[PDB]
């Protein structure tokens, strides 16, 4: 009651990154981010929100 | 004719990789590093001074 939870079930939906590609591919304010390497040799990628 | 001349040349002549694998092996107290990714995953690699 300070701690705040939450309930989670790992689906697993939305798994096919064609359908990925196109919801990041148009949002509302949805800023997403990336990290597509190494974790030792990468870095972070948003993009706009809405395309 | 007080202070010593400077004749810097981009020489290349250390440029064979396995010289500089040598170089970098048998080198003294140095701290060598090496950015070999592009800028979206770039990273540096640390190593010690000698191995």
New interface residues.
Partial sequence: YTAVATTADVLSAMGSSTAVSTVTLGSGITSAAVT???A????N?TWVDNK
């Fill in positions: 597509f390497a190494i030792t040799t990468d870095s990628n």
